[PDB]
Protein backbone atom coordinates (compact mmCIF):
# COMPACT_ATOMS: atom_id res chain seq x y z
CA UNK A 1 0.00 0.00 0.00
CA UNK A 2 2.74 2.44 1.01
CA UNK A 3 0.02 4.78 2.32
CA UNK A 4 2.03 7.34 4.29
CA UNK A 5 -0.73 9.63 5.56
CA UNK A 6 -1.32 9.45 9.34
CA UNK A 7 -3.86 7.09 10.92
CA UNK A 8 -7.22 8.54 11.97
CA UNK A 9 -8.73 6.93 15.08
CA UNK A 10 -12.23 6.78 16.53
CA UNK A 11 -12.62 8.04 19.24
CA UNK A 12 -9.82 10.58 18.73
CA UNK A 13 -8.05 9.53 21.95
CA UNK A 14 -4.62 8.70 20.45
CA UNK A 15 -1.82 11.25 20.81
CA UNK A 16 0.15 12.01 17.63
CA UNK A 17 3.26 13.83 16.38
CA UNK A 18 1.65 14.66 13.00
CA UNK A 19 -1.58 16.58 12.54
CA UNK A 20 -3.48 15.19 9.57
CA UNK A 21 -2.91 18.43 7.62
CA UNK A 22 0.77 17.39 7.62
CA UNK A 23 2.07 19.66 10.38
CA UNK A 24 4.68 18.02 12.62
CA UNK A 25 4.61 19.18 16.25
CA UNK A 26 8.30 19.76 16.82
CA UNK A 27 9.56 22.40 19.29
CA UNK A 28 6.46 21.65 21.40
CA UNK A 29 6.58 23.59 24.69
CA UNK A 30 5.08 21.26 27.30
CA UNK A 31 1.89 22.67 28.91
CA UNK A 32 2.15 24.14 32.41
CA UNK A 33 -0.52 23.04 34.90
CA UNK A 34 -2.33 26.05 36.40
CA UNK A 35 -4.91 24.53 38.74
CA UNK A 36 -4.16 22.82 42.05
CA UNK A 37 -4.62 19.04 42.19
CA UNK A 38 -7.64 18.11 44.34
CA UNK A 39 -7.53 15.61 47.21
CA UNK A 40 -10.22 13.01 47.85
CA UNK A 41 -12.68 14.55 50.30
CA UNK A 42 -13.81 11.07 51.35
CA UNK A 43 -10.23 10.21 52.23
CA UNK A 44 -10.13 13.52 54.11
CA UNK A 45 -13.31 13.20 56.21
CA UNK A 46 -13.97 9.47 56.48
CA UNK A 47 -12.40 6.68 58.50
CA UNK A 48 -9.90 4.37 56.82
CA UNK A 49 -10.09 0.61 57.34
CA UNK A 50 -7.24 -1.83 56.56
CA UNK A 51 -8.67 -4.23 53.98
CA UNK A 52 -6.63 -7.10 52.55
CA UNK A 53 -9.28 -8.83 50.42
CA UNK A 54 -12.00 -7.45 48.16
CA UNK A 55 -14.47 -7.83 51.04
CA UNK A 56 -14.62 -7.02 54.73
CA UNK A 57 -16.81 -8.16 57.63
CA UNK A 58 -17.90 -6.22 60.69
CA UNK A 59 -19.66 -7.50 63.80
CA UNK A 60 -21.09 -5.38 66.61
CA UNK A 61 -22.89 -5.86 69.89
CA UNK A 62 -26.61 -5.16 69.65
CA UNK A 63 -28.34 -6.46 72.79
CA UNK A 64 -27.11 -6.38 76.41
CA UNK A 65 -28.51 -8.54 79.23
CA UNK A 66 -31.24 -7.34 81.55
CA UNK A 67 -31.19 -7.53 85.33
CA UNK A 68 -33.76 -8.66 87.88
CA UNK A 69 -34.54 -7.82 91.46
CA UNK A 70 -34.92 -11.24 93.12
CA UNK A 71 -36.26 -12.03 96.55
CA UNK A 72 -34.06 -13.92 98.97
CA UNK A 73 -33.90 -17.47 97.62
CA UNK A 74 -35.98 -16.71 94.51
CA UNK A 75 -35.08 -18.16 91.11
CA UNK A 76 -32.70 -15.85 89.21
CA UNK A 77 -34.21 -15.26 85.76
CA UNK A 78 -31.87 -15.66 82.78
CA UNK A 79 -31.03 -12.98 80.20
CA UNK A 80 -29.36 -12.76 76.78
CA UNK A 81 -26.67 -11.03 74.67
CA UNK A 82 -26.97 -10.35 70.91
CA UNK A 83 -24.77 -9.21 67.98
CA UNK A 84 -25.23 -8.05 64.36
CA UNK A 85 -23.07 -8.21 61.20
CA UNK A 86 -22.32 -5.85 58.30
CA UNK A 87 -20.05 -6.08 55.25
CA UNK A 88 -18.38 -3.97 52.55
CA UNK A 89 -16.86 -4.72 49.14
CA UNK A 90 -14.36 -3.01 46.80
CA UNK A 91 -14.67 -1.76 43.21
CA UNK A 92 -12.03 -1.05 40.54
CA UNK A 93 -11.38 2.31 38.88
CA UNK A 94 -9.32 2.50 35.69
CA UNK A 95 -8.40 4.27 32.47
CA UNK A 96 -6.02 3.82 29.49
CA UNK A 97 -4.11 6.52 27.58
CA UNK A 98 -2.93 5.51 24.05
CA UNK A 99 0.12 7.22 22.55
CA UNK A 100 1.94 6.86 19.22
CA UNK A 101 5.63 5.97 19.41
CA UNK A 102 6.55 8.91 17.19
CA UNK A 103 4.73 11.39 19.43
CA UNK A 104 6.35 9.92 22.52
CA UNK A 105 9.80 10.41 20.96
CA UNK A 106 9.57 13.69 19.03
CA UNK A 107 6.87 15.77 20.73
CA UNK A 108 6.48 15.01 24.44
CA UNK A 109 9.11 12.61 25.80
CA UNK A 110 7.83 13.00 29.40
CA UNK A 111 4.10 12.71 28.58
CA UNK A 112 3.19 9.73 30.79
CA UNK A 113 4.93 11.19 33.87
CA UNK A 114 2.87 14.37 33.66
CA UNK A 115 -0.29 12.25 33.33
CA UNK A 116 0.06 10.28 36.59
CA UNK A 117 -1.04 13.31 38.69
CA UNK A 118 -4.02 14.13 36.50
CA UNK A 119 -5.11 10.47 36.56
CA UNK A 120 -4.88 10.28 40.34
CA UNK A 121 -6.92 13.49 40.58
CA UNK A 122 -9.57 12.13 38.20
CA UNK A 123 -9.84 8.93 40.27
CA UNK A 124 -10.23 10.81 43.56
CA UNK A 125 -12.95 13.00 42.08
CA UNK A 126 -14.77 9.98 40.63
CA UNK A 127 -14.67 8.37 44.08
CA UNK A 128 -15.82 11.46 45.97
CA UNK A 129 -18.74 12.06 43.63
CA UNK A 130 -19.75 8.41 43.82
CA UNK A 131 -19.68 8.00 47.60
CA UNK A 132 -20.87 11.45 48.66
CA UNK A 133 -23.41 12.39 46.00
CA UNK A 134 -24.33 9.04 44.42
CA UNK A 135 -23.34 10.53 41.06
CA UNK A 136 -21.32 9.16 38.18
CA UNK A 137 -22.71 5.61 38.08
CA UNK A 138 -22.11 4.82 41.74
CA UNK A 139 -21.10 1.12 41.81
CA UNK A 140 -21.77 0.78 45.52
CA UNK A 141 -25.32 0.26 46.69
CA UNK A 142 -24.30 2.75 49.37
CA UNK A 143 -23.86 6.50 49.62
CA UNK A 144 -24.45 9.52 51.84
CA UNK A 145 -27.06 10.97 49.50
CA UNK A 146 -28.81 7.60 49.44
CA UNK A 147 -28.82 7.25 53.23
CA UNK A 148 -30.25 10.76 53.41
CA UNK A 149 -32.91 9.73 50.90
CA UNK A 150 -33.95 6.67 52.90
CA UNK A 151 -34.09 8.60 56.19
CA UNK A 152 -35.66 11.77 54.70
CA UNK A 153 -33.31 13.62 57.08
CA UNK A 154 -33.60 16.85 55.09
CA UNK A 155 -34.24 20.43 56.28
CA UNK A 156 -35.85 22.91 53.87
CA UNK A 157 -34.89 26.59 53.79
CA UNK A 158 -32.25 29.33 53.70
CA UNK A 159 -28.81 29.38 55.30
CA UNK A 160 -29.60 30.84 58.73
CA UNK A 161 -28.44 30.33 62.29
CA UNK A 162 -31.90 28.88 62.89
CA UNK A 163 -31.74 26.24 60.16
CA UNK A 164 -28.07 25.43 60.71
CA UNK A 165 -28.69 24.77 64.41
CA UNK A 166 -31.72 22.66 63.51
CA UNK A 167 -29.60 20.78 60.97
CA UNK A 168 -26.98 19.89 63.54
CA UNK A 169 -29.68 19.00 66.11
CA UNK A 170 -31.17 16.56 63.60
CA UNK A 171 -28.19 14.30 64.33
CA UNK A 172 -28.35 14.26 68.11
CA UNK A 173 -32.01 13.39 67.73
CA UNK A 174 -30.41 9.99 67.01
CA UNK A 175 -27.73 10.47 69.69
CA UNK A 176 -25.08 11.39 67.10
CA UNK A 177 -23.03 14.58 66.99
CA UNK A 178 -22.10 16.37 63.79
CA UNK A 179 -18.38 16.36 63.02
CA UNK A 180 -17.94 18.43 59.84
CA UNK A 181 -19.74 20.19 57.00
CA UNK A 182 -19.57 19.59 53.24
CA UNK A 183 -20.42 22.62 51.12
CA UNK A 184 -19.98 24.20 47.70
CA UNK A 185 -17.40 26.98 47.74
CA UNK A 186 -19.84 29.11 45.74
CA UNK A 187 -21.99 29.44 48.89
CA UNK A 188 -19.53 30.74 51.45
CA UNK A 189 -20.87 34.08 50.23
CA UNK A 190 -24.14 33.15 51.94
CA UNK A 191 -22.47 31.71 55.03
CA UNK A 192 -20.37 34.90 55.37
CA UNK A 193 -23.48 37.08 55.83
CA UNK A 194 -25.36 35.37 58.70
CA UNK A 195 -24.99 36.71 62.25
CA UNK A 196 -26.60 36.02 65.64
CA UNK A 197 -28.89 38.94 66.61
CA UNK A 198 -28.43 38.27 70.36
CA UNK A 199 -24.74 37.61 70.97
CA UNK A 200 -23.92 39.45 67.73
CA UNK A 201 -21.19 36.99 66.76
CA UNK A 202 -20.97 35.38 63.33
CA UNK A 203 -21.53 31.66 62.94
CA UNK A 204 -19.02 31.28 60.06
CA UNK A 205 -15.29 32.03 60.31
CA UNK A 206 -14.25 33.63 57.03
CA UNK A 207 -10.64 33.36 58.24
CA UNK A 208 -10.57 29.75 59.45
CA UNK A 209 -13.33 28.23 57.28
CA UNK A 210 -15.09 27.00 60.42
CA UNK A 211 -18.89 26.88 60.58
CA UNK A 212 -20.35 26.86 64.10
CA UNK A 213 -16.93 25.65 65.23
CA UNK A 214 -16.94 22.63 62.90
CA UNK A 215 -14.59 22.34 59.90
CA UNK A 216 -16.00 22.98 56.42
CA UNK A 217 -14.83 21.00 53.38
CA UNK A 218 -15.44 22.28 49.85
CA UNK A 219 -16.60 20.16 46.91
CA UNK A 220 -15.49 21.08 43.40
CA UNK A 221 -18.27 18.97 41.85
CA UNK A 222 -21.04 20.72 39.93
CA UNK A 223 -23.72 18.37 41.30
CA UNK A 224 -23.89 19.96 44.77
CA UNK A 225 -25.96 23.11 44.28
CA UNK A 226 -25.06 26.46 45.83
CA UNK A 227 -27.99 26.46 48.27
CA UNK A 228 -27.26 22.93 49.55
CA UNK A 229 -25.30 21.97 52.67
CA UNK A 230 -24.52 18.53 54.11
CA UNK A 231 -23.46 17.44 57.60
CA UNK A 232 -22.93 14.16 59.40
CA UNK A 233 -20.93 12.19 61.94
CA UNK A 234 -18.26 11.27 59.41
CA UNK A 235 -16.65 8.77 61.77
CA UNK A 236 -19.54 6.56 60.57
CA UNK A 237 -18.29 6.72 56.94
CA UNK A 238 -15.77 3.93 56.34
CA UNK A 239 -13.61 3.60 53.23
CA UNK A 240 -10.89 1.15 52.25
CA UNK A 241 -8.22 0.95 49.56
CA UNK A 242 -7.23 -2.66 48.78
CA UNK A 243 -4.91 -1.53 45.94
CA UNK A 244 -3.30 1.87 45.38
CA UNK A 245 -3.07 3.33 41.86
CA UNK A 246 -1.09 0.88 39.72
CA UNK A 247 0.43 2.10 36.44
CA UNK A 248 1.48 -0.28 33.66
CA UNK A 249 2.83 0.73 30.24
CA UNK A 250 2.34 -1.74 27.37
CA UNK A 251 3.99 -1.85 23.95
CA UNK A 252 2.38 -4.98 22.51
CA UNK A 253 -1.30 -5.57 23.38
CA UNK A 254 -4.58 -4.68 21.61
CA UNK A 255 -6.98 -1.82 22.44
CA UNK A 256 -10.42 -2.92 21.26
CA UNK A 257 -12.22 0.22 22.50
CA UNK A 258 -10.37 2.41 19.94
CA UNK A 259 -10.81 1.60 16.24
CA UNK A 260 -8.74 2.40 13.16
CA UNK A 261 -10.21 4.44 10.33
CA UNK A 262 -11.02 1.17 8.56
CA UNK A 263 -12.70 -0.20 11.69
CA UNK A 264 -9.99 -2.67 12.69
CA UNK A 265 -9.03 -2.77 16.40
CA UNK A 266 -5.86 -0.84 17.28
CA UNK A 267 -2.89 -3.19 17.67
CA UNK A 268 -0.08 -1.52 19.60
CA UNK A 269 2.77 -3.70 18.34
CA UNK A 270 1.80 -3.84 14.68
CA UNK A 271 0.99 -0.11 14.68
CA UNK A 272 4.05 0.97 16.73
CA UNK A 273 2.14 2.49 19.64
CA UNK A 274 2.46 2.63 23.44
CA UNK A 275 -0.33 2.78 26.03
CA UNK A 276 -0.58 3.55 29.76
CA UNK A 277 -3.07 1.74 32.04
CA UNK A 278 -3.98 3.05 35.51
CA UNK A 279 -6.14 1.05 37.93
CA UNK A 280 -7.25 1.36 41.56
CA UNK A 281 -9.46 -0.65 43.95
CA UNK A 282 -11.67 1.38 46.32
CA UNK A 283 -14.31 0.28 48.88
CA UNK A 284 -16.96 2.39 50.65
CA UNK A 285 -19.27 1.68 53.60
CA UNK A 286 -21.92 3.70 55.46
CA UNK A 287 -21.81 2.38 59.03
CA UNK A 288 -25.03 4.12 60.14
CA UNK A 289 -27.55 5.46 57.63
CA UNK A 290 -28.94 7.87 60.25
CA UNK A 291 -25.62 9.68 60.81
CA UNK A 292 -26.14 12.16 57.93
CA UNK A 293 -28.42 15.13 57.30
CA UNK A 294 -28.89 17.68 54.54
CA UNK A 295 -30.09 21.29 54.28
CA UNK A 296 -31.72 22.15 50.93
CA UNK A 297 -33.16 25.40 49.49
CA UNK A 298 -36.95 25.53 49.42
Amino acid sequence: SNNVKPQVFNPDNVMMHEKKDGTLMNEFTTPILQEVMENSKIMQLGKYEPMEGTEKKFTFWADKPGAYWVGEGQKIETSKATWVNATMRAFKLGVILPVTKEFLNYTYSQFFEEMKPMIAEAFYKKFDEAGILNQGNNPFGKSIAQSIEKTNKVIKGDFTQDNIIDLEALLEDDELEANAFISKTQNRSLLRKIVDPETKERIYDRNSDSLDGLPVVNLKSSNLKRGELITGDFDKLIYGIPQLIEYKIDETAQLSTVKNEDGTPVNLFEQDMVALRATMHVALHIADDKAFAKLVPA
Partner: protein, 51 residues
Protein backbone atom coordinates in the same frame (compact mmCIF):
# COMPACT_ATOMS: atom_id res chain seq x y z
CA UNK B 1 41.11 5.12 38.86
CA UNK B 2 42.65 8.37 40.09
CA UNK B 3 39.92 9.72 42.39
CA UNK B 4 38.58 13.25 42.67
CA UNK B 5 40.24 13.57 46.08
CA UNK B 6 43.52 12.73 44.28
CA UNK B 7 44.06 9.16 45.50
CA UNK B 8 44.64 5.94 43.58
CA UNK B 9 41.57 3.74 44.06
CA UNK B 10 40.90 0.13 43.10
CA UNK B 11 37.35 -1.11 42.47
CA UNK B 12 35.99 -4.45 41.29
CA UNK B 13 33.99 -4.46 38.05
CA UNK B 14 31.13 -6.91 37.67
CA UNK B 15 31.67 -9.72 35.18
CA UNK B 16 28.18 -9.48 33.69
CA UNK B 17 28.84 -5.89 32.56
CA UNK B 18 32.56 -5.73 31.69
CA UNK B 19 34.79 -7.16 28.98
CA UNK B 20 38.11 -6.53 27.24
CA UNK B 21 39.07 -6.43 23.55
CA UNK B 22 42.61 -7.71 22.94
CA UNK B 23 45.21 -7.16 20.24
CA UNK B 24 45.09 -9.94 17.66
CA UNK B 25 48.82 -10.71 17.90
CA UNK B 26 50.21 -13.65 19.86
CA UNK B 27 51.18 -11.21 22.60
CA UNK B 28 47.51 -10.26 23.12
CA UNK B 29 47.93 -6.86 24.66
CA UNK B 30 44.61 -5.47 25.86
CA UNK B 31 43.50 -2.83 23.37
CA UNK B 32 40.33 -1.54 25.00
CA UNK B 33 37.95 -2.38 27.83
CA UNK B 34 34.26 -1.66 28.13
CA UNK B 35 31.74 -1.40 30.95
CA UNK B 36 28.03 -0.95 30.39
CA UNK B 37 25.11 -0.67 32.78
CA UNK B 38 21.34 -0.52 32.66
CA UNK B 39 20.28 2.82 34.12
CA UNK B 40 16.78 2.79 35.62
CA UNK B 41 14.56 4.32 38.28
CA UNK B 42 13.19 1.84 40.79
CA UNK B 43 9.63 2.75 39.78
CA UNK B 44 10.22 0.82 36.52
CA UNK B 45 7.96 3.18 34.58
CA UNK B 46 8.93 2.35 31.00
CA UNK B 47 12.02 1.58 28.86
CA UNK B 48 14.52 -0.38 30.96
CA UNK B 49 16.73 -0.84 27.88
CA UNK B 50 18.91 2.30 28.16
CA UNK B 51 22.61 1.52 28.79
Amino acid sequence: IRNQDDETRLYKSDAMSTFIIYDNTVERNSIAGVRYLRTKPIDKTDEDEVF
